[model samples]
Target: PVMHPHGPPSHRPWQMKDLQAIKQEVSQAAPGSPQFMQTIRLAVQQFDPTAKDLQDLLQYLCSSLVASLHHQQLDSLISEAETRGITGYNPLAGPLRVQANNPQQQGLRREYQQLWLTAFAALPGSAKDPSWASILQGLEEPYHTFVERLNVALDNGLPEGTPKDPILRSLAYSNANKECQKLLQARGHTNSPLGDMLRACQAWTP
Candidate 1:
């Protein structure tokens, strides 16, 4: 059912009435909702379920998400590449040149850094495909090292120049770092760290 539009798993066809009922239950659910998603899976696997049955579903949801966390890492890697300019990207391994001490590279680094922070913020409660169950298995999220260095850059003051929404983007990423992580962790996702420092000039809302 997750692989919908591509159709069901050969013999497993989508049921209109059942899907309608599932939609009704989650009509007000926020996008990227784990509970709503788990509900759908429950509906798919069995329309009528016991309380224990649904609780067990949440368990598997968290377990499976951690297992596929590497996809989350890969997405960040791609974002990092864009930070270096996709024209000659491959920021991690393409070249070993010392980065120029200029605003352009600084700006690029900052943009992707904030983007990755936002990416991490946005990831949880999203729908998962059982199809990618084998993907990114066993590998850990690699953004930690990248983000660590990005933080080092930011310590001097979040590599500056111009961003489309420097103030807004900055504020949004800050919210993502603190608020989003909490939301993800509370909702059965693996408890994860996003970042540990505020920028040298950053503010915290008391």
Candidate 2:
């Protein structure tokens, strides 16, 4: 005679030991492997997992993160995020306005201009760095266009009249034409309003 009188699934009562063993096996199985799939199916049959829990587990399996090192590193990344406590962030998104535009007018030329300003801005202290001038030399279009576009992006942030406002404006000054550079330089040191220097930059055309 069976120790338990239950003869089938309909009459059997829940057993904590069996459930725990199921969970243990599921965890031990290499994710996405045949054994993992079988163990997962058995566990699912035994109990319902929460939506978030199921998603987290399935994401690892579906993404093929079965390697032991990758799994540990994922835990480390999770801990790092928890420590920072920053939420509602999307790493996949970029500047909406700075996206790729329509195809270029050039026919077969490979010399195409990409988003150099965005690339430069990603570096530390790029707003005030003079080296961005050389980076611009390798870009397409007149220097004025890139300079103006960059100034526009900068204008959207970094409040004016702050101690660093003039410093940020140097991005345009350093990237502009040599004559315009000297003009802005002369105006700035001659006690002219900084706005005048900035306006002169916007007004300077290629």
Candidate 3:
């Protein structure tokens, strides 16, 4: 065992001191909650996931358990907002969403959305290749298109009352210099549709 300046070893929350517990409030879950046990479980059918251990992996599991539980609280908070009609914005996603609004803050949805298509125009260089990827909407799958998700993520995430034009284009116009480099790096000459689309995403700031 490594020497600690703090105290001795007992393995309980009381012994751990700073550890969090499950029942504790969300705000109190800063570092993690072992005492409060925010995360109910991480699941280990092995009877003893800790039958073997490492410095970080052992500690990592503890942290994971707590974090998942804390998120349970966050999900609860989001649901609470949804019930009241606050729009429940998730910061993990792009800023287009207006959480807790129930609907009505308005961020650029059109230009940002249309901005994706611009990358397509660069394709179909001349008539011989005529890459039709630019005209296509669905990115990965036909049913779930890139533009569709961009719209879906922004549109439904917020309330029905949100607007069309939002932000970004005004702040910074498209810069050719930066995008060109990306074009080259992603296979350059072919103007890879995948590459082009990537450039489109880069133009808009979150």
The candidate that wins on lDDT is: 2
Off by over 4 Å in 3: 1-62, 87-206
Comparing 1 with 3 on TM-score, the higher-scoring candidate is 1
Candidate 2 positional error at 138, Å? 10
Ranking by lDDT: 2, 1, 3
Cα lDDT of all candidates, in order?
0.36, 0.38, 0.28
lDDT of 3 by residue, 72-107 (tens): 444454445445543323445544222211112212
Model 2 is weakest, by summed lDDT over 10 consecutive residues, at 108-117
Task: Write model 1 residue lDDT over 21-76, tens digit each, in one string.
Answer: 66666454322344344455456345222222222332333455642452465366
Give all TM-scores, in the order shown: 0.21, 0.27, 0.17
How well does candidate 3 match the true structure in TM-score terms?
0.17
lDDT minimum window of 10 residues, candidate 3: 45-54
Q: Give RMSD (Å) of candidate 1 vs. truth.
A: 23.2
| Model 1 CA lDDT for position 130 | 24
